[PDB]
Amino acid sequence: FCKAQTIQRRLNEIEAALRELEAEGVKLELEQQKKLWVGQLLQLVDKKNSLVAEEAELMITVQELNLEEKQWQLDQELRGYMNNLKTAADRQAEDQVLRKLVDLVNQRDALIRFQEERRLSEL
């Protein structure tokens, strides 16, 4: 048991901030004050990039938890069969449960390399 919904709050924080910045940037697009409205705009984008960067990382961490939940919920299901002489159909179904479990490892094998390939471009 782990209420990791603290990620969700920060998610809505960023969305609002972006939706704002989206708006704030528009009113910004509407000759010494020029050089100021110049710098400010590039300062909006670097915040967006940050926010989007963070946002992606969180969503990856959301998909990860997603598959982690729908992994235990079927680990029990597998344990039902193998934990005598069940109907051969009972064996085909067990077979279909396993092909799905591998489908998740591939997924977790991707999200991990998303995390890894993302921290690598930072260098």
Numbering used by the authors: 925 to 954, 964 to 1016, 1020 to 1059
What are the paper's exact sentences on this?
MICAL1, identified as a Molecule Interacting with CasL, belongs to the family of MICAL proteins, conserved from insects to humans. MICALs are intracellular proteins that catalyse oxidation–reduction (redox) reactions through their flavoprotein monooxygenase (MO) domain and use F-actin as a substrate. These enzymes bind flavin adenine dinucleotide (FAD)2627 and use the coenzyme nicotinamide adenine dinucleotide phosphate (NADPH) and O2 in redox reactions, causing disassembly of F-actin likely by directly oxidizing specific actin methionines. Active, GTP-bound Rab35 directly interacts with the tail of MICAL1 through a flat three-helix domain revealed by X-ray crystallography.
The interaction with Rab35 required the last 150 residues of MICAL1 (aa 918–1067), in which the last 41 residues are essential. The C-terminal region of MICAL1 has been described as comprising segments of coiled-coils2137, potentially implying oligomerization of this enzyme. We determined a structure of this domain by X-ray crystallography at 3.3 Å resolution. Surprisingly, the structure consists of a curved sheet of three helices, exposing two opposite flat surfaces, which differs from most three helices folds that usually form compact bundles. This structure is formed by anti-parallel intramolecular coiled-coils interactions: while the first part of helix H2 makes coiled-coil interactions with helix H1, the second part of helix H2 interacts with helix H3 also with coiled-coil interactions, and no interactions are formed between the H1 and H3 helices. Biophysical measurements by MALS and SAXS indicated that this domain is a monomer, and thus does not form an elongated dimeric coiled-coil, as previously found for other Rab-effectors4647. Overall, the domain of ∼80 × 30 Å in dimension exposes two large curved surfaces on either side of the helices. The mutant S2 (R1012E, M1015R, L1034K and V1038E) and the single mutant M1015R had very low binding affinity to Rab35 indicating that both H2 and H3 helices participate in Rab35 binding, while the opposite face of the three helical domain defined by the S1 mutations do not participate in Rab35 binding. Most of these residues are conserved among MICAL proteins, consistent with Rab-binding properties of several MICAL family members and with the crystal structure of Rab1 bound to MICAL-cL48. This Rab35-binding surface (oval in Fig. 5c) explains why the Δ41 fragment (aa 918–1026), which lacks the whole H3 helix, is unable to bind Rab35 (see above). Importantly, we reveal that Rab35 activates the enzymatic activity of MICAL1 by displacing the inhibitory intramolecular interaction between the C-terminus of MICAL and its catalytic monooxygenase domain.
